[PDB]
Design a protein around this ligand. Structure first.
Ligand SMILES: CCCCCCCCCCCC[N+](C)(C)[O-]
Length: 421
């Protein structure tokens, strides 16, 4: 959903992803902890989807006087997940999984006065995870998996009112007192709002791996320590710019003008490392508790550079992050033989220094408020229903020459089905 926990299941979506990595009622946490494999005695799959309907709005006014307002820049999305877990011995067991990874969808109206720093920022990743696990004894379990990350990316930026803004930076400038000068302002005054200053898109695979350990006080109380590797996406796409090649080589903040000519861009993205610790304690045949303390290294993601075969910067964007923490407490109610009742809150800390808040990268991941319930038909198959209320912040921003006043929120609704063999 945000900068820390993806959407791998509707059960978790119901417990605000608390104690993931220790819980194991269903075939979903395996993707969260390999070692949890030794927690299943028979083949068990689980498939599903999670729908996301956000509400992110930007606001403020351009020096150029035009409005910097934009409602719902975050579209809606559906996200599937399929899991499969099965034993091999009494010590070996494997499991596959296909879920989503880090991703954001920011989309402004090409005719927005904020083109320069707000156009289209889409990152959608699908992750296939293969993994096994070895159980040393009745208390220690270890798992290790491999996961190739597919990455569909796209970036575009425009010239909202920037052009007419610069035009007035000249008429006020001393060179605007000159023939060659005031003829150079009109040029930049012509430029319409939806002119592509930057356009990049590529599609390549990522490779990483995670490690999981487990430890149970018994069949009813456990704890987990997991680590997740960073994925290096080396993107081989194409670059464009509807700007005229004549702006080039003056050292101006460079979205490289190629006059619509498709070049060949190069960009590397870093998909952060994780080190989550979680604890599962079933204190009552009816009730149990889960809680996790994760940690992602967004420090690894510092820019969004884009080069050419030559290696020169085609487009340069700075982020400069910082590691963030996440905490989640959750309660599960095993009421009936047919029903369950989960609940949870979860606080995520922003991996973004105030001074680098962009509008393409919404800064609205402040906490989780979730609920859910599962109806089982007969010990071998059931259906999970989850829902989360995710809220952001009232944080002001300063990017380029504008003043925005962002915000955020979002509701998650998921529905999962499971089965044992
Ligand atoms: C053509 C390449 C486009 C690159 C798109 C990469 C965007 C990386 C943004 C990371 C922001 C964090 N996230 C995933 C949680 O939204």
């Amino acid at each position: 959903a945000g900068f820390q926990l993806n959407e791998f299941s509707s059960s978790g979506l119901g417990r605000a992803y608390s104690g993931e990595g220790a819980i194991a009622d269903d075939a979903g946490n395996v993707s969260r902890n390999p070692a949890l494999i030794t927690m299943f005695d028979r083949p068990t799959f689980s498939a599903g989807a999670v729908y996301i309907d956000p509400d992110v709005n930007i606001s403020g006014t351009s020096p150029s006087g035009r409005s910097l307002k934009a409602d719902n820049i975050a579209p809606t999305a559906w996200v599937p997940n399929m899991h499969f877990v099965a034993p091999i011995n009494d010590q070996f067991g494997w499991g596959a999984s296909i879920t989503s990874n880090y991703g954001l969808a920011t989309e402004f109206n090409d005719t927005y006065a904020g083109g320069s720093v707000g156009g289209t920022t889409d990152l959608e990743t699908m992750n296939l995870n293969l993994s096994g696990a070895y159980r040393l004894n009745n208390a220690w379990s270890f798992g290790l998996g491999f996961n190739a990350v597919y990455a569909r990316a796209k970036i575009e930026r425009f010239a909202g009112d920037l052009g007419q803004l610069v035009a007035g930076q000249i008429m006020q400038s001393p060179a605007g007192q000159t023939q060659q000068g005031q003829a150079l302002a009109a040029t930049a005054n012509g430029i319409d709002s939806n002119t592509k200053i930057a356009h990049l898109n590529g599609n390549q695979w990522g490779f990483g791996w995670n490690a999981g350990i487990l430890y149970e006080l018994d069949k009813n109380n456990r704890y987990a320590l997991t680590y997740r590797s960073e994925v290096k996406i080396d993107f081989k796409g194409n670059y464009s710019s509807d700007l005229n090649r004549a702006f080039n080589n003056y050292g101006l903040p460079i979205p490289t003008a190629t006059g619509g000519a498709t070049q060949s861009g190069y960009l590397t993205l870093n998909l952060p490392e994780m080190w989550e610790v979680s604890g599962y304690n079933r204190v009552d045949p009816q009730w149990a508790i889960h809680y996790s303390l994760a940690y992602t290294s967004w420090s690894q993601f510092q820019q969004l550079k884009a080069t050419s075969t030559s290696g020169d910067t085609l487009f340069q964007k700075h982020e400069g992050f910082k590691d963030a923490y996440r905490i989640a407490l959750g309660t599960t109610y095993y009421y009936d033989d047919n029903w369950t009742f989960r609940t949870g809150i979860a606080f995520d800390d922003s991996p973004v220094p105030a001074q680098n808040r962009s509008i393409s990268i919404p800064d609205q991941d402040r906490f989780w408020l979730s609920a859910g319930t599962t109806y089982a038909f007969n010990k071998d198959a059931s259906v999970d229903v989850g829902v989360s209320y995710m809220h952001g912040q009232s944080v002001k921003i300063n990017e380029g020459p504008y003043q925005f006043e962002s915000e955020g929120k979002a509701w998650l609704f998921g529905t999962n089905f499971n089965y044992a063999f």
